[PDB]
Subunit: 193 residues, 2 copies
């Protein structure tokens, strides 16, 4: 039958137990999925030495994912684009396969709570029915500030793939992109503006 | 007909004109290929704030490419392995496709000149007949030291791929792995040993 993900019940890679205790309710609220056989789901975390709003300024830009994500040749949103839920983008993917475009829909965008997410709704690639949520969270300790970004997804496991290799793949990509996010926004922080 | 690559005649991404002028002869010697229609070739560079021998200690470890390369699930060399030209490794690749192993042969290993290279000799993936060379080079300016790593390859362009997308893919992967090499060996340098 279907089941609920348990991301909110264990400490994910990249997070401390202290940070987890502060985020458990957010993980439950935004990073929970009902998951069916044949799907995989994961939660990744990344610490960033930058203020929450600096990081959020990059995370929220649905029209420019290539600012922090790897393997993007181009991203188009057309002309009428406004940052509203329901908007779509066409991402041309860099892969060893022939050309492929991923069409992606903006599912969530909450600037007050720092939540966004999207769904892959078409394209010929290996993350069919992918859906993902990213949240941004601030931390402080004796005047020092930092941010944690949480990114979770659910996706279908292709016929002939094992669950483990689909999850390893998607996890590897998400982890690399959060590392890029960390570099980009830490640079932005060092420089001000 | 066949032609020679011109990597040694222009400044590659990631290198300064001053650094190029010092390396042009090495690019000619080690990063030249005779290339046929249907193949692509590229030269990438990466500056590393670490001594040449620190970087070389990681670059030369043919049995542990996952120390600096991305998307490696495992790498096996068996039991009799000695670091000699002709040895092979089986690299299990992380991809969105079903399981695949790349069998790779060590083509060059010169510890005096800091040159190594390998050939993909089998496996079902999209870099057929890939062959690559990596060289490591030291620089100094008023007591400050740094290293440049050059990595070139030639590879077949799969039927139905464009040249541009094969090169974009292989370039993206090589560039990410050299960035990882830079982080790993800069950390090793900061810590000594
Ligand atoms: C970069 O952004 C995105 C990336 C992806 C990539 C998915 C995928 O399956 N990629 C495969 C290559 C591949 C295989 C077969 C058909 C097409 C592509 C891989 O890399 O192994 C999806 C949405 C995105 O927004
Ligand atoms: C990580 O190390 C290596 C990586 C590669 C990857 C090659 C390749 O074509 N990868 C594809 C995915 C893919 C597609 C179809 C069949 C198998 C795989 C991609 O990612 O789009 C080769 C040698 C290596 O040593």
């Amino acid at each position: 039958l279907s089941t609920i993900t348990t991301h909110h019940l264990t400490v994910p890679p990249g997070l401390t137990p202290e940070e987890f205790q502060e985020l458990s309710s957010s993980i439950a609220e935004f990073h929970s999925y009902r998951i069916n056989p044949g799907q995989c789901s994961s939660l990744l975390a990344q610490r960033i030495h930058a203020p929450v709003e600096t990081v959020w300024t990059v995370v929220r830009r649905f029209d420019k994912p290539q600012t922090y994500k790897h393997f993007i040749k181009s991203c188009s949103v057309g002309e009428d684009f406004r940052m509203t839920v329901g908007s779509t983008r066409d991402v041309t993917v860099i892969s060893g396969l022939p050309a492929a475009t991923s069409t992606e829909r903006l599912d969530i965008l909450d600037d007050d709570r720092h939540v966004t997410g999207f769904s892959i709704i078409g394209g010929e690639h290996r993350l069919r029915n992918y859906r993902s949520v990213t949240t941004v969270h601030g931390f402080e300790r004796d005047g020092e500030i930092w941010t944690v970004v949480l990114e979770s997804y659910v996706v279908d496991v292709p016929e002939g793939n094992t669950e483990e290799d689909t999850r390893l793949f998607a996890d590897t990509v998400v982890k690399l992109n959060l590392q890029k996010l960390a570099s980009v926004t830490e640079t932005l922080a060092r420089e001000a503006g």
